[PDB]
């Protein structure tokens, strides 16, 4: 039984949430923000990512060089990432270096220079990032997947933004973005590891007390997405490996089917030929794929957002004449979530998940990420007892009922990259979303 997550508020509405571990000597403190690329419009798309670069480019006090030195002297490191719905800025340090790290984070968030000279310098760095993501095939695939599934909607935009915006982002629009979005009621200060909650609340009162509150404070993790069944083909015959993602509209964080979708995802599961145990996994798809050498890997996913999600699978394969078989067998395993699954598969997946959801949290950064994600999506940290109860409530009837309304005979979004000549057209893929025998 893990220690209790303590939670306090300030007057402005900043949440402080902490989970102490007296067995470790490091601590991860940081700020989780319920804001991301989705908060931009089409004209300033890319701003949130642009800001993340400038946050480390110097503040009103410390210059770029002083900032570097201050963190070097702390001994740990700082890290940040911007997603579609969430921004994180954290600092991993030693136990007694926590007041330094909180102070630096408070500085870079509230008091950043955003000097025209630095805007102009990063404008090239970010322009170069546009031509080098091209190599990270999984990210290429998932960014096209969002672009097509949520065609012309805010979730469909990339985080980097178009080349055109990168050239026209001003310090004005950067400042406007962080003034509108980085408000106290949307922020959580999180500490995990060797942190005292009461110490962290004092540091919050010292550094984050003059944060703006929004005019209309909605609860944390408050949002209409209209999924488009569609496909993007990025054929490249010179690549040896095909990367394919197939997804349907999935579930939001607060859906009543959130756990049912996780159990269904666990019934299909993951596979990787390079891992020794993967040839012996219980999943039917795993057995088909491994016995027939259909793929190097596959990974089931169930991504959630505040008001929608994508549920599906990501496949990689060198077997370019049997891509059809790989896709066929994958979608026939999905069909069986509607037609055939019983207590046998459901209870096995629940067993595997009850541990999996706890196992994931194995370091201070993972714990901090879990507290931060849960607080900014659900408004609370859900105790393992509650999670165990929600998983236990999933029956085989729930899985079949969910699959029949979410997967069965539904439109898919499909992205293929690489040697995908063998991937059939949209209709033949989408026809595998049902079984004529049922």
């Amino acid at each position: 039984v893990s220690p209790k997550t303590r939670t306090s508020n300030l007057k402005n509405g900043l949440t402080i949430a902490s989970e102490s571990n007296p067995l470790v000597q490091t601590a991860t403190v940081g700020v989780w923000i319920d804001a991301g690329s989705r908060n931009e419009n089409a004209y300033n798309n890319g701003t949130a990512h642009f800001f993340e670069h400038l946050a480390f480019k110097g503040t009103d006090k410390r210059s770029q060089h002083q900032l570097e030195l201050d963190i070097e002297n702390m001994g740990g490191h700082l890290n940040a990432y911007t997603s579609r719905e969430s921004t994180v800025y954290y600092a991993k340090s030693f136990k007694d270096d926590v007041p330094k790290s909180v102070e630096i984070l408070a500085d870079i968030l509230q008091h950043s220079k955003l000097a025209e000279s630095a805007i102009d310098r990063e404008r090239e760095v970010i322009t170069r990032e546009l031509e080098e993501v091209n190599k990270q095939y999984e990210e290429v695939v998932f960014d096209h997947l969002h672009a097509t599934a949520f065609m012309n909607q805010p979730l469909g935009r990339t985080i980097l933004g178009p080349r055109e915006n990168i050239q026209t982002i001003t310090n004005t629009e950067l400042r406007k973005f962080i003034t509108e979005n980085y408000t106290a009621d949307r922020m959580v200060l999180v500490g995990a590891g060797a942190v005292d909650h009461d110490a962290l609340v004092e540091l919050a009162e010292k550094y984050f007390s003059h944060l703006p509150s929004s005019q209309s404070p909605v609860p944390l993790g408050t949002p209409i997405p209209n999924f488009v069944g569609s496909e993007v083909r990025l054929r490249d015959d010179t690549m040896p490996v095909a990367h394919i993602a197939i997804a349907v509209e999935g579930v939001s964080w607060t859906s009543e089917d959130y756990y049912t979708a996780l159990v269904a995802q666990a019934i299909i599961g993951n596979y990787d030929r390079a891992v020794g145990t993967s040839r012996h996994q219980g999943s039917r798809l795993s057995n088909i794929v491994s016995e027939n050498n259909l793929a190097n890997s596959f990974q089931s996913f169930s991504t959630s957002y505040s008001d929608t999600g994508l549920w599906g699978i990501y496949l990689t394969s060198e077997n370019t004449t049997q891509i059809d078989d790989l896709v066929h067998f994958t979608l026939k395993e999905w069909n069986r979530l509607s037609t055939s699954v019983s207590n046998l598969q459901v209870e096995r997946a629940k067993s595997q998940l009850k541990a999996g959801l706890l196992l994931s949290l194995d370091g201070t950064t993972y714990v901090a990420e879990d507290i931060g994600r849960q607080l900014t999506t659900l408004g609370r940290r859900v105790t393992p007892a509650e999670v165990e109860a929600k998983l236990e409530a999933v029956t085989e009837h729930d899985v079949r009922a969910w699959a029949q309304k979410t997967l069965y005979d539904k439109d898919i979004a499909l992205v293929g990259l690489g040697p995908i000549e063998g991937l059939y057209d949209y209709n033949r893929i989408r026809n595998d979303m049902s079984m004529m025998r049922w």
């Binding site: 496909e231 057209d425 949209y426 209709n427």
Partner: protein, 53 residues
Amino acid sequence: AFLTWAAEPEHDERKKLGLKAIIVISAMLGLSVYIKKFKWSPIKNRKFIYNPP
């Protein structure tokens, strides 16, 4: 008239069966157009962006 009947005594039945066939076949033709267009729309609607390597 009588001799015409003698040459083709199926005449009346044939033309009534033909009316049923015409109606069914015409409806099937209409539906087959809808279904073909439905199934072909992803091909007809396909768009390309080419970036020369």
